[PDB]
Write a protein that binds this ligand. Sequence first.
Ligand SMILES: Nc1ncnc2c1ncn2[C@@H]1O[C@H](COP(=O)(O)OP(=O)(O)OP(O)(O)=S)[C@@H](O)[C@H]1O
Ligand SMILES: Nc1ncnc2c1ncn2[C@@H]1O[C@H](COP(=O)(O)OP(=O)(O)OP(O)(O)=S)[C@@H](O)[C@H]1O
Ligand SMILES: Nc1ncnc2c1ncn2[C@@H]1O[C@H](COP(=O)(O)OP(=O)(O)O)[C@@H](O)[C@H]1O
Ligand SMILES: [Mg+2]
Ligand SMILES: [Mg+2]
Lengths: 120, 325, 316, 354, 335
Amino acid sequence: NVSLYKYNAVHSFRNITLEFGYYAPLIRKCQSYKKKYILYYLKNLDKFSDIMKVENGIDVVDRIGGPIEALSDHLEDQKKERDRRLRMLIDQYERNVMMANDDLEDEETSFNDDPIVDSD
Amino acid sequence: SKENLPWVEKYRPETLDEVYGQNEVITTVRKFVDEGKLPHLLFYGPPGTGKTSTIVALAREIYGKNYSNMVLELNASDDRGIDVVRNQIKDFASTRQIFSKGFKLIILDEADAMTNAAQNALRRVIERYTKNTRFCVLANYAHKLTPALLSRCTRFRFQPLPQEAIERRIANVLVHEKLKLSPNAEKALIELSNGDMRRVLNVLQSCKATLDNPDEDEISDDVIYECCGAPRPSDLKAVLKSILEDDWGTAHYTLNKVRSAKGLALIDLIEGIVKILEDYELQNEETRVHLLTKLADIEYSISKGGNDQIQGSAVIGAIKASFEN
Amino acid sequence: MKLKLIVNGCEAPDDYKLLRTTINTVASLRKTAILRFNSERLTIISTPKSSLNSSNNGTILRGDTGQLWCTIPHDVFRLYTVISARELNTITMECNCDSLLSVFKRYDRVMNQGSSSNMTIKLQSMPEWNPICALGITFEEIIMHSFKVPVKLLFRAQDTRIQEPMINYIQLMMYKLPPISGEFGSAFHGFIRRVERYSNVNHIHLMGVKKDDVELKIIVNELDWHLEICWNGPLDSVIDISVMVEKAEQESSSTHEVIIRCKDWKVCSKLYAAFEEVVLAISHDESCVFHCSLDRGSKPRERGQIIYYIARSKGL
Amino acid sequence: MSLWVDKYRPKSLNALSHNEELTNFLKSLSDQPRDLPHLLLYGPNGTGKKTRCMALLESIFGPGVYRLKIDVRQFVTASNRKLELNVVSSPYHLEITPSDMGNNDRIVIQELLKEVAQMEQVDFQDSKDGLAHRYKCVIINEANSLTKDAQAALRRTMEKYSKNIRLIMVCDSMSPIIAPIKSRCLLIRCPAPSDSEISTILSDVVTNERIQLETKDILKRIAQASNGNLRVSLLMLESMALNNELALKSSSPIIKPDWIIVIHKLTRKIVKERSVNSLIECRAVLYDLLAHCIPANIILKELTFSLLDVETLNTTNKSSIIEYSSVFDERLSLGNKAIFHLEGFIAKVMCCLD
Amino acid sequence: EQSLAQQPWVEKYRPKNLDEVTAQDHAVTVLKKTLKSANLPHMLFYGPPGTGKTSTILALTKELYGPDLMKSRILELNASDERGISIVREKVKNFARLTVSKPSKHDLENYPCPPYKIIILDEADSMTADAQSALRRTMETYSGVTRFCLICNYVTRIIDPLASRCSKFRFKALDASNAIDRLRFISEQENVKCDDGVLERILDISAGDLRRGITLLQSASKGAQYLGDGKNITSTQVEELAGVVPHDILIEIVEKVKSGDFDEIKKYVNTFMKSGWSAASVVNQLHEYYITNDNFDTNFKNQISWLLFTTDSRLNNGTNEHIQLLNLLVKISQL
Ligand SMILES: Nc1ncnc2c1ncn2[C@@H]1O[C@H](COP(=O)(O)OP(=O)(O)OP(O)(O)=S)[C@@H](O)[C@H]1O
Ligand SMILES: Nc1ncnc2c1ncn2[C@@H]1O[C@H](COP(=O)(O)OP(=O)(O)OP(O)(O)=S)[C@@H](O)[C@H]1O
Ligand SMILES: Nc1ncnc2c1ncn2[C@@H]1O[C@H](COP(=O)(O)OP(=O)(O)O)[C@@H](O)[C@H]1O
Ligand SMILES: [Mg+2]
Ligand SMILES: [Mg+2]
């Protein structure tokens, strides 16, 4: 749900069990650590503009299913948290459609050349 | 109206005199009705041996032409759960006859499809109302019947149809129709029947359809093989000879040619070769073991599809290895 | 792009009713509606091809093909100040039906209370947020109640892509439905709503046969028993991978049939109950058009039009 | 931002960069898509089959195929068990993964797909007179995971309603596909990219991301470690770049999926010690792996090929290992619980090694 | 023109009448003469995929009844429909008991209109044994007004009583000898230019399935049209489209097996499976190569035939292709 509603990416459950479930959380954790370090440096003080786009409460940064320790109502609560985060994700995308759409390339400059006029 | 019917239904026996191949059972039931001492009956046998026909004919003999009024017939196409047994069968068995015509008859065709609960409920219904009602059960698989029900019924076994009965029925059909059958064709038809009259009738109808001019054309064994698309005995003999004498390439070519000549199926060839080998005199017994095991495995694999050429090569190799012992 | 408009319900109630019905139908048909403000009339459009509507992918998932077009002459509004720099001074917007419907419901409540104020509508640039603007609506309540609705403007290229469907008029059979205000209005209203008594029915087969010289029938074959409903009352007849849909050969030159959905029939029933003059046009195995016309004269005035096009739900 | 796997996803046939013959064949398919037959793309996982399917759909319809939304479809079983499926839809095509419903996948074929096949898509013509009809495209992900009943239910739906629907199925192996389904589809083989092409793609990504690369040998090593899986190659590239401050070096470790290292450790333990207690520990490891929803067949394959790489083992041991692997893979296919078969395979391997 | 060219060739060239059905004369003759005898029995069509069973039954129904009457005389159910025991006992039974609908004057004058209905159970082998048993007496009781047609690929899945009740028709495999004329006609209708022997190669590759051959021909035609060079299609292109392993790759595999080194075989197989070749095709090609080779002895051929049979059965069970292929190659190497 997070991937679909934040990155417009659709992935299969099999790929999550095999590859994404481990690689994606590690990448997001590294990105979050870098973002925190950069924020601390700025507070104490564009190239990495894709790194501070990770949200603390919406991005998964933990291995799905926990670590594989082999040789080195919890379910209800997890479902409630999933539903909550899905509601926030739907809220984030709901306004995006009306806010702007790709549509096609038009004469946008001419549109600004005839601006609205409001006066009584 | 009978003309439009398929031959399997058009030639259904109407009287017990028309049921062949079950002389002992038929005589017993006929004399039972003559003495009016019919017990609870079980008819156990393989498909198309005359169980349903026999029971319907017996009902007709007992009740004349109005048997439908005092005979309750139920089969697998109807629901026969425990509720049905408790209500419908029980009420029918516990009510008086329409015109005091002796006892009532309940026929449970294909009773091996009934549930254990319904069969258990049937025990006391059968026992309590024996005076007013008699039960008839028909089955192909006895293991589906509970021990109590089997104990309550007098058992009669319908054997696979003997050859002579099939010949007499075929002669009756041939005189009915304007059809001619050759002795070799009749022999092949009996061989492929496997004691089932339905197969005989269906194949005969297909053969008549195949004839260009049935008013004068005679059915030969070739017509039967064409209609059934089955291998000829000569083809099976040639394939077996090539497998047991020629080299791998020659045997492969022979099998491919024999199959492509008439589009024969590999399973039919396997069955024919198994039948042929069942009569072979083997001086080594391990050969029989290997033949049976490998051919059964190949048949099971074929039943699920797979690669046809690989299966044929497997048959060839299995036979060769078995006979190399 | 000034769009100052004034709406009054105490003068010419027919126009206010027409506008209310148009907004209600567009809201009940789809989430968003297109509004074209020309120098002559206002066009309200509900089409699956709209930028906001196409996102829902209704066409490929539920067969949402029907198109609804309403024309409102500028005489409806007390003040019609529409100035633009496009063809015939046309300004195109894509608004959300829910907010507009709520605003009009509140206006109706206020009017029913007893107020006789006027509603002023204008286009404004909200600094809070195809740029998105606001539709400022203001009115008095015997207290200046003001509400604003987000709106998105469309370019000329976007405007020209939304075109009204055109039907083969020569190969089209039109029937003039009895007026609702007449003695036969209730009978026909019940006849239209009859099929609603069957919950599981999803498609209806409308048929029209010559020989008051024509007859109309509704056929349902989705039940265990064939069902036919006939109207015996008076009824007068007006005298890429894209491929063409296959049309079944006509049974006779004087019979026109089409299979449609029950939701479209309910919408048509609502339209019939709304307006007086209603015409049903059938293109055999092709489509069904519901045309509601409101007539007003002074030098006859412009005719208020509501056209609902419904594509065949199934082939014949 | 989005993961580099999706960030640099090609969005057109002309944007493809490996297996040019397959690209040309796909382009030829899109020349006259009116009579496009049902398609079945088969190939190794992560080679770009879904990407090529989307590129073909884009060529047939346009970029709008990439505007995807998600809906929830509710189904009810005979026992009243209510469950849900995710339907990914675009204005021109639909995407479904019936295997997510397990043994109930057939229901999805019987109710949803059939309905989609039965509802003809028609629309008013913008310019010409009369309606226009277009067939709907449906993608079935993980086709090889469908039960035989669902595959059987697909047959007449594909045949009778060919006018209104065209199926595009994708799979990693055609062995589980029943013969009637294979007969009804145009089979398209999708080879994996070569190491050179993977290295070229990774170098392009590196140049785009301004990541300092000491030498191109790192990309070749990553491609070798990925075993032809481009998605895995990109994921490990991103992980290594992030863990090395976006400055890769020949000494930077190559990150592999954790379950793979776990299976390697299990193989080492199996080779080292062979006893009942070792078997119980191996069972614990197997149960831990299964707890993460790793398929049993994948576990067996990975364990078998990890065992075959051990140098101390001889030819006889490897032959016995592969024999047991084949037998127990068949048992898993025909079985109900995977633990029995995996434990039996490990026990047989322990017996053969000792 | 576009409307006609909007269908795949398999559906576009589906036989319309019984005359268009090819290579299945042994049953088509009986079905055709049934149009005059009006003595249609219960039918059990069985055969391998894409041999013309569904086409034959559809053509027979169309010829018997016609476009209008069929809608009231035909009840079709297949695997996509629910066919539980309750369905068999209620819906099928109700239809079988339905009175024969009155034909119209046009129907009587134009079509024979036999006085019974037809129930078609396509993919009957998917039905449960109990549901099949529920049909036994329904078929017999109402044979005067209803006839049943079961269709299947695996006849053993039909319970013995039903097979006994039904007259059996086996559809033969369609190969280069009995189905070449239909494929040539289809190619001529589409102006597909191909080298001599290409159609025979397609039929040989299809292995008894004319649907697969037609699809392959359509794919080759599309490729040739896209190329637009005016050259005739070649057997190499057909093999590439069909997924046939090139001869050189098979020779390399054979040499690797002959070498007998486990590690080299493992590495070569690991590299080979990257291409995505289907294991079934590789096994079939290996069987063809080894069984027809004159450089091997009888014992080797027997052992390899059994090994190939075992591997093919395992693959048909839906197993991992890499493991099975490696095991087969190692076993052949140890021979
Ligand atoms: N003994 C028989 N004598 C003459 N015709 C027979 C005989 N048995 C079977 N037939 C023929 O085969 C048809 C079917 O016979 P049935 O008695 O219904 O078969 P069955 O013994 O009931 O097998 P099952 O258990 O129902 S599969 C009859 O209508 C006859 O045409
Ligand atoms: N005997 C045939 N004559 C002509 N065309 C055929 C024949 N068999 C198959 N075809 C072609 O293949 C298509 C499929 O034929 P079908 O009758 O559906 O085969 P099938 O036997 O039903 O296969 P299964 O059992 O459903 S997998 C037809 O539309 C034809 O184009
Ligand atoms: N030609 C290509 N150029 C660049 N990246 C590619 C190409 N083909 C595939 N990929 C990458 O491979 C990844 C996985 O491909 P995908 O289609 O999901 O594999 P599968 O065949 O398993 O569905 C995608 O994220 C995509 O970026
Ligand atoms: Mg019987
Ligand atoms: Mg079929």
